Design an enzyme around this catalytic site. Structure first.
Site, PDB file in Angstrom:
ATOM      1  N   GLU A  35     -45.205  34.858  18.831  1.00  0.00           N
ATOM      2  CA  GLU A  35     -44.690  35.901  17.946  1.00  0.00           C
ATOM      3  C   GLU A  35     -43.598  36.706  18.608  1.00  0.00           C
ATOM      4  O   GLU A  35     -42.595  36.989  17.976  1.00  0.00           O
ATOM      5  CB  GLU A  35     -45.790  36.875  17.476  1.00  0.00           C
ATOM      6  CG  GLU A  35     -46.836  36.300  16.505  1.00  0.00           C
ATOM      7  CD  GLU A  35     -46.264  35.970  15.139  1.00  0.00           C
ATOM      8  OE1 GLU A  35     -45.113  36.388  14.874  1.00  0.00           O
ATOM      9  OE2 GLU A  35     -46.928  35.235  14.369  1.00  0.00           O
ATOM     10  N   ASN A  46     -36.387  42.193   8.475  1.00  0.00           N
ATOM     11  CA  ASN A  46     -36.457  41.187   7.429  1.00  0.00           C
ATOM     12  C   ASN A  46     -35.560  41.593   6.264  1.00  0.00           C
ATOM     13  O   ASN A  46     -35.208  42.765   6.107  1.00  0.00           O
ATOM     14  CB  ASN A  46     -37.890  41.015   6.964  1.00  0.00           C
ATOM     15  CG  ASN A  46     -38.848  40.969   8.114  1.00  0.00           C
ATOM     16  OD1 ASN A  46     -39.890  41.630   8.101  1.00  0.00           O
ATOM     17  ND2 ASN A  46     -38.477  40.228   9.151  1.00  0.00           N
ATOM     18  N   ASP A  48     -36.151  41.996   3.225  1.00  0.00           N
ATOM     19  CA  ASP A  48     -36.743  42.990   2.356  1.00  0.00           C
ATOM     20  C   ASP A  48     -36.640  44.381   2.916  1.00  0.00           C
ATOM     21  O   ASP A  48     -37.166  45.333   2.346  1.00  0.00           O
ATOM     22  CB  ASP A  48     -38.199  42.660   2.080  1.00  0.00           C
ATOM     23  CG  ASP A  48     -39.060  42.743   3.318  1.00  0.00           C
ATOM     24  OD1 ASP A  48     -38.501  42.785   4.443  1.00  0.00           O
ATOM     25  OD2 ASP A  48     -40.298  42.744   3.150  1.00  0.00           O
ATOM     26  N   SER A  50     -37.902  45.234   5.763  1.00  0.00           N
ATOM     27  CA  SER A  50     -39.093  45.474   6.560  1.00  0.00           C
ATOM     28  C   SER A  50     -38.800  45.024   7.981  1.00  0.00           C
ATOM     29  O   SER A  50     -37.845  44.284   8.216  1.00  0.00           O
ATOM     30  CB  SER A  50     -40.345  44.800   5.958  1.00  0.00           C
ATOM     31  OG  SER A  50     -40.417  43.416   6.261  1.00  0.00           O
ATOM     32  N   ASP A  52     -40.750  43.774  11.806  1.00  0.00           N
ATOM     33  CA  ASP A  52     -41.950  43.369  12.512  1.00  0.00           C
ATOM     34  C   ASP A  52     -41.830  43.985  13.891  1.00  0.00           C
ATOM     35  O   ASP A  52     -40.793  43.861  14.534  1.00  0.00           O
ATOM     36  CB  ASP A  52     -42.002  41.869  12.645  1.00  0.00           C
ATOM     37  CG  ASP A  52     -41.935  41.180  11.316  1.00  0.00           C
ATOM     38  OD1 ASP A  52     -42.673  41.583  10.393  1.00  0.00           O
ATOM     39  OD2 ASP A  52     -41.013  40.368  11.152  1.00  0.00           O
ATOM     40  N   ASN A  59     -45.912  43.818  10.622  1.00  0.00           N
ATOM     41  CA  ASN A  59     -44.951  44.211   9.601  1.00  0.00           C
ATOM     42  C   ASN A  59     -45.044  45.638   8.993  1.00  0.00           C
ATOM     43  O   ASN A  59     -46.122  46.098   8.608  1.00  0.00           O
ATOM     44  CB  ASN A  59     -44.903  43.110   8.535  1.00  0.00           C
ATOM     45  CG  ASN A  59     -43.697  43.208   7.654  1.00  0.00           C
ATOM     46  OD1 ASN A  59     -43.756  43.860   6.620  1.00  0.00           O
ATOM     47  ND2 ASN A  59     -42.595  42.559   8.042  1.00  0.00           N
TER      48      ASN A  59
END
Length: 129
Positions: A35, A46, A48, A50, A52, A59
């Site tokens: 990850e 991201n 959207d 968002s 991480d 997220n």
């Protein structure tokens, strides 16, 4: 901070991730490697809007509040910045919350692809623990 493999495994062990819900320590270390490459400051934006955060790439859409993500949900009740710390406390408390709620560790796609079904003991090889 970039954790070393055994250093992160020991830190996750101290925090009770060892076999939490039946998911062995090696599963968690394996997940973190794929990850974030053990990098506590890792952040991934991201489309959207968002992001991480941290070692487990949690997220902001639903788990933490970063002040800039639509929806305004914060299931773990923490600022996303807490996940960027070299202290893994908040990351662990939040991940335990994620794994209890849906399809277990399947929440991490990297885990599904490179960890699930493989001999994960190899991840804690040579670690004092």
């Amino acid at each position: 901070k970039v954790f070393g493999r055994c250093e992160l495994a020991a830190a996750m062990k101290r925090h009770g991730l060892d076999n939490y819900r039946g998911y062995s320590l090696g599963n968690w270390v394996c997940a973190a490697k794929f990850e974030s490459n053990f990098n506590s400051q890792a952040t991934n934006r991201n489309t959207d809007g968002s992001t991480d955060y941290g070692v487990l790439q949690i997220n902001s859409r639903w788990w933490c509040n970063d002040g800039k993500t639509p929806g305004s949900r914060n299931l773990c009740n923490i600022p996303c910045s807490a996940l960027l710390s070299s202290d893994i406390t908040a990351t662990v408390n939040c991940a335990k919350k994620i794994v209890s709620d849906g399809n277990g560790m399947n929440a991490w796609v990297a885990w599904r692809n490179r960890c699930k079904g493989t001999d994960v003991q190899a991840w804690i090889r040579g670690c004092r623990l």
